[PDB]
């Protein structure tokens, strides 16, 4: 949706209502492993967003502070 910084709780939310609105877990309830899987992918995506922020910083000479750029 947006490039605004998200929050890990927000990502966990969006994941959980996506899961519950999806019917496959409805037919297969009892996946408490997807809980910490969602946690782990949440930190993964958080690191990815940090990388994206670094990409924005390096995409502009004003924002980039590297001698090379």
């Amino acid at each position: 949706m947006s490039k605004t910084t998200p929050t890990k709780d927000s990502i966990r939310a969006e994941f959980e209502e996506l899961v519950e609105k999806d019917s496959f877990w409805s037919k297969f309830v009892g996946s408490q492993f997807v809980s910490m899987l969602t946690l782990f992918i949440t930190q993964i995506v958080y690191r990815c967003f940090q990388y994206a922020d670094a990409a924005l910083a390096e995409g502009f000479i004003s924002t980039a502070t590297r001698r090379s750029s």
Binding site: S26, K27, F28, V29, G30, Q32
Partner: protein
Amino acid sequence: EQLGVRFGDGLIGQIPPEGSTITLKVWCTNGDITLVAGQNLTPVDSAANLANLISVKTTTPITAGTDA
């Protein structure tokens, strides 16, 4: 590995009279419980004769129990 109770005296509780009964009703379970929609139950005892008359269908998932 045993749990129990102590019957105190004086101002700390009171002792039940000798011969009086103390019934202990323990709500027990298996810990975390997973209940997926799409199953049928088998009521028994007073509802054993009701099992064929009443069907119990799992429609709302039941999960998020706790363990030790």
